[PDB]
């Protein structure tokens, strides 16, 4: 159930 993610070394926080 993907939702919305938010990695540190990505930098984004939108989508999962």
């Known amino acids: ?3 919305i993610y ?3 070394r990505t930098x984004k926080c ?3």
Do not use: D, H, L
């Open 6 to 8: 938010c990695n540190r």
């Open 1 to 3: 159930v993907p939702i």
């Open 14 to 16: 939108q989508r999962f």
